[PDB]
Design an enzyme around this catalytic site. Structure first.
Site, short mmCIF file in Angstrom:
data_model
loop_
_atom_site.label_atom_id
_atom_site.label_comp_id
_atom_site.label_asym_id
_atom_site.label_seq_id
_atom_site.Cartn_x
_atom_site.Cartn_y
_atom_site.Cartn_z
N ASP A 1 -9.10 5.88 13.26
CA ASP A 1 -9.30 5.25 11.96
C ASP A 1 -9.75 3.81 12.12
OD1 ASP A 1 -9.64 5.40 9.25
OD2 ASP A 1 -7.57 4.95 8.80
N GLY B 117 0.83 -1.19 0.00
CA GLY B 117 0.00 0.00 0.00
C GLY B 117 0.86 1.24 0.00
N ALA B 118 0.26 2.35 0.34
CA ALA B 118 0.92 3.64 0.46
C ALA B 118 1.96 3.63 1.56
CB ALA B 118 -0.11 4.72 0.76
O1 LIG Z 1 1.81 0.38 8.88
C1 LIG Z 1 0.82 0.97 8.47
C2 LIG Z 1 -0.50 0.25 8.24
N1 LIG Z 1 -0.38 -1.19 8.19
C3 LIG Z 1 -0.17 -1.91 6.93
C4 LIG Z 1 -0.17 -3.34 7.37
C5 LIG Z 1 -0.05 -4.51 6.65
C6 LIG Z 1 -0.10 -5.73 7.29
C7 LIG Z 1 -0.29 -5.82 8.67
C8 LIG Z 1 -0.30 -7.16 9.31
N2 LIG Z 1 -0.90 -8.13 8.60
C9 LIG Z 1 -0.90 -9.36 9.14
N3 LIG Z 1 -1.49 -10.36 8.45
C10 LIG Z 1 -2.25 -10.22 7.22
C11 LIG Z 1 -2.33 -11.54 6.49
C12 LIG Z 1 -3.13 -11.30 5.24
O2 LIG Z 1 -4.46 -10.86 5.54
C13 LIG Z 1 -4.43 -9.61 6.22
C14 LIG Z 1 -3.65 -9.69 7.50
N4 LIG Z 1 -0.36 -9.72 10.32
C15 LIG Z 1 0.24 -8.74 11.00
C16 LIG Z 1 0.28 -7.44 10.54
CL1 LIG Z 1 1.08 -6.24 11.49
C17 LIG Z 1 -0.40 -4.63 9.40
C18 LIG Z 1 -0.36 -3.40 8.75
C19 LIG Z 1 -0.45 -2.01 9.27
O3 LIG Z 1 -0.55 -1.63 10.43
N5 LIG Z 1 0.80 2.28 8.20
C20 LIG Z 1 1.84 3.20 8.64
C21 LIG Z 1 1.36 3.94 9.88
O4 LIG Z 1 0.11 4.58 9.66
C22 LIG Z 1 2.22 4.21 7.56
C23 LIG Z 1 3.45 4.84 7.61
C24 LIG Z 1 3.81 5.77 6.64
C25 LIG Z 1 2.93 6.07 5.62
C26 LIG Z 1 1.70 5.45 5.56
C27 LIG Z 1 1.35 4.52 6.52
#
Ligand SMILES: O=C(CN1Cc2ccc(-c3nc(NC4CCOCC4)ncc3Cl)cc2C1=O)N[C@H](CO)c1ccccc1
Length: 345
Positions: A139, A24-25
């Protein structure tokens, strides 16, 4: 170094055998085998130093999640970055690997009433802790609720979170906002900066509604359509709730609308447990002053099989940290400082 879908993933020696999860972003996420604890983990690569607002989010995420320790809040296990500010272009944030999220689960799976009850309990239990630290998530939505294979739930993404500030919550009508449209409380579009705990309870109400039907309850197609959907179900605000909106633009907008009656929850949700609908109603209250708080929601009869306030912990102290004025270059420095504890040393 290992690569995955173009990108370098400089996470070794500790983390090996990467599989792509998504993107993602924010950056890119993989699972990886943690060679110390002998489990796969989630690792997200963040590359934010070229825009101040990615820096803000990254720092909010990092500071909040390192301070918080709770079963229903995703932790940070490890952070990997270069040893010097100069060499630091990426930050790798290591987290418990979760099987899915409530967004993915809602697109394919019918939830039993017992699942809805348990998921709602865990959301509110985590949110109690968040609010007790005087923090607002801001959010909350299905994709920010992670789920493991036994349906344990963890709130994630604290990059929009803020310290609560209810004395400075007031603003004008149609004042622009960042958080996710379908889960925005009506007051955001009317007179609120979204600096009070009530904003999060609204989002939880929306998530409850979506768990009951697998469809978003207020799927607005753009900014003021969101209030259209909200009022289409809640109906016109009462005289008393209107008198709480002193801003004239916002009040006269509401007065200009034809009278609409409330759509009863039990016709929108004919198969729902009646206690769940009573709680829904209290979370989806138009007037934020009258909206149920997290601790009240937990004590609601719907959640009686789980409610146990001695096992719903609060934070040891309120959170405080602001960031809007600080440049890109200072935020890099703070992220560097905040991640130092994870370095060999
Ligand atoms: O970090 C993020 C948002 N994100 C993106 C993400 C992807 C995966 C997981 C995650 N996924 C899984 N499993 C998956 C298996 C498949 O099905 C779905 C679940 N297990 C554990 C985790 Cl932690 C967590 C996150 C999270 O918190 N944005 C920062 C701060 O706002 C940001 C910083 C700078 C600019 C923009 C944004």
């Amino acid at each position: 170094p290992e690569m995955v879908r173009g990108q370098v993933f400089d996470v070794g020696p500790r983390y090996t055998n990467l599989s792509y999860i998504g993107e993602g972003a924010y950056g890119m996420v993989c699972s990886a085998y943690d060679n110390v604890n002998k489990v796969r983990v989630a690792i997200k690569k963040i590359s934010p130093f070229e825009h101040q607002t990615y820096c803000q989010r990254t720092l909010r995420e990092i500071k909040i999640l390192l301070r918080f320790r709770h079963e229903n809040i995703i932790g940070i296990n490890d952070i990997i970055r270069a040893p010097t500010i100069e060499q630091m272009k990426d930050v790798y944030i290591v987290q418990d690997l979760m099987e899915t999220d409530l967004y993915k689960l809602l697109k394919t799976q019918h939830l039993s009433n017992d699942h809805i009850c348990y998921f709602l309990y865990q959301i509110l239990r985590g949110l109690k802790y968040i609010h007790s630290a005087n923090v607002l998530h801001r959010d909350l939505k299905p994709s920010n609720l992670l789920l493991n294979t036994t349906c344990d739930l963890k709130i994630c993404d604290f990059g929009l979170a803020r310290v609560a500030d209810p004395d400075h919550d007031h603003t004008g009508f149609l004042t622009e906002y960042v958080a996710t449209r379908w889960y925005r409380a009506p007051e955001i579009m009317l007179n609120s900066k979204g600096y009070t705990k009530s904003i999060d309870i609204w989002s939880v109400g929306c998530i409850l509604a979506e768990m009951l039907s697998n469809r978003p309850i207020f799927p607005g197609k753009h900014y003021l359509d969101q209030l259209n959907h909200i009022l289409g179900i809640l109906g016109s605000p009462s005289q008393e709730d209107l008198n709480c909106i002193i801003n004239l633009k916002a009040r006269n907008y509401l007065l200009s609308l034809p009278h609409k009656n409330k759509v009863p929850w039990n016709r929108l949700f004919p198969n729902a447990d009646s206690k769940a609908l009573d709680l829904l109603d209290k979370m989806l209250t138009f007037n934020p002053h009258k909206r149920i708080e997290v601790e009240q929601a937990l004590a609601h009869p719907y959640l009686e099989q789980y409610y146990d306030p001695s096992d719903e912990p609060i934070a040891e102290a309120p959170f405080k940290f602001e960031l809007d004025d600080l440049p890109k270059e200072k935020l890099k420095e703070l992220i560097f400082e905040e991640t130092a504890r994870f370095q060999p040393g």
